[PDB]
């Protein structure tokens, strides 16, 4: 009822097993027993697979496991017990798993990790996941006893009732800590215990409206934390300020993210200049996605944000209904080098103010993909204010046909026009371009002379002929999949003098001797075509249809 | 008795040129125009002829004369009317300001000064407010006396009149006139 391959990888997934299947062997290296109905696991059910390296028992209905059930799994490296029905954990289970690297106990209705440390012998553990939405309510100092270093630690404690002080402090290093907290009640206690270990902190679903700061024990060395992210949090202008005060403890913080967050209240907070945080330390990257401001009304004093983003080099604000970056605000971002405003509401009329005379002085890369831009001509003219812009992405914008004449930033060498619905390319596009992406459009041909072009992306278009080499005397890379070419003679191939990489795959070809002879004569061009011959299937005739070369 | 007028017409005023005006989600009964010359988002109510005048916008190259006041919506940065088109050319158009005052002891005095017009298009809001303040500071308007008129005389006859015993009607603050067509100004305080 189960099938294994030649590498000892056996599939017993989505079966109706009510117990571990019999006749397992020492030749088995991987076992997938997910989506089953194994209510009970006995002492010898898994004794035969002494060489098992991977054990997935995800989504079964496991409610009982004998203490010594894993006695012979000394070679096990991966144990996934997520989404099961284990309401109690036994330290006996993990004792013989000295080689264990990944352990998932998340999604089980247990209230605690037990009265006995579960992991003191998992010396090789790198990843640990625990907790649940409804019942996990307490963290004790012994819970994580024995762990020195972890790459990823995820703790779901949305229903946490008590955290024993110094519990998280025993872990020396944690590259990525994910915390699911519904309230901010224990945030300060937890934070204090992770200043020396966590390199990347992620907070999910936390309501921080009631959060209030208070001085933490200043300690010996600096925090190794480089990234801090908030996911699904709720903030107020007041509480947001309180959070910033934590920055004094993570002086090496370089990146901050706010994803799917909500900012409530009106827009007035009016504090003294002392409770206001105006410094952002060494943070150079700020990333915001799907931010909801349900009452963007009473808000009026943007300057606190001016000192916050003063020394910031990278900013991302995705899918957050942005329609305007005020000129005066744009002029204050003197250090900004990268700005991403994808999936917003930018239109030329508002963009003219955002990229006003003096806006984003140091900007090098600007991404305006999937906005409401309609005109390439007016847009290039508007962006002329950006003297250092070198890369522009205006993909996923519905542009009207382009004209013969256009003005663009003098240093612009990269341009993304993917998915703009264009049918023709005209001299609007500057010859200063080194990289051009015009994929996923409606082009029937390409006749634009670009003397400096090194890379052209034009996949998913309607070209029936690879474009003339003379249009690109120095092209290095060309990707033209999902188009409409069918032949590719040696002449045109050798025509590009500097060409290195070509992607003609996933196309519809005609299968003729006049071509096949060329295929056999020089397979030395297999080092110019990627995904060859995987994606180079034929179409005609019906005999060779869907057959590789 | 004239304490309210003196308080209002001694408020600080703000003026900004070449501003970018925009409209938001109309959250209350009266639409607002927003400008951010620096770091403050200013909300300016659209009343009177401005309701017809401004639609979805955006509106570039506007000047604003702003006076901040107590209001219902509890906004902290709110002025009313006073929106005009910015100068196309620089203007220094000097006009005569005459001031007649009949004091508490029936004595009639007449004084004169010059008033510098610097805008091609100027709001009644701006003229009313600045002139009354000048009259308050220098001629004790709303001290013992708080009646009479300000009259803006245009070169081709027309008049714009501000009655001093009460605040300027709200809708007229959006009313704009040709700054370069003002001939003179006559004040009569009594
Ligand atoms: C660590 C430090 C963290 C600091 C982060 C700073 C960046 C914060 C992200 C700002 C999100 C902007 C917002 O997402 O968009 C601007 C909102 C639109 O949001 P709305 O729901 O209120 O639209 C109302 C309906 N409508 C469309 C008719 C107007 O404009 C509002 O109306 C008010 C108009 C005022 C616009 C000026 C604010 C600058 C905005 C973004 C700068 C980047
Ligand atoms: C130009 O932009 C497009 C999209 O705006 C990029 O194409 C892909 O977009 C999808 C979005 O559905 C992403 O998932 C992919 O990662 C994107 N890249 C690829 C290679 O598929 C495209 O990559 C951009 N061009 C360049 C040169 O960066
Ligand atoms: C380009 O970036 C430099 C970086 O310091 C900045 O000083 C300058 O103002 C920007 N613009 C020009 C025209 O150099
Ligand atoms: Cl809008």
JSON list of C-alpha atoms and ligand atoms in Angstrom, two decimals, chain A residues 323 345 350, chain B residues 23-25 56, ligand 4:
[
{"chain": "A", "resi": 323, "resn": "UNK", "atom": "CA", "xyz": [-0.64, 57.67, -4.09]},
{"chain": "A", "resi": 345, "resn": "UNK", "atom": "CA", "xyz": [-1.69, 54.15, -6.67]},
{"chain": "A", "resi": 350, "resn": "UNK", "atom": "CA", "xyz": [1.04, 62.93, -8.21]},
{"chain": "B", "resi": 23, "resn": "UNK", "atom": "CA", "xyz": [-7.95, 65.99, -1.94]},
{"chain": "B", "resi": 24, "resn": "UNK", "atom": "CA", "xyz": [-8.49, 62.98, 0.31]},
{"chain": "B", "resi": 25, "resn": "UNK", "atom": "CA", "xyz": [-11.30, 60.66, 1.39]},
{"chain": "B", "resi": 56, "resn": "UNK", "atom": "CA", "xyz": [-10.71, 65.99, -7.76]},
{"chain": "C", "resi": 4, "resn": "LIG", "atom": "CL1", "xyz": [-7.07, 60.47, -4.05]}
]
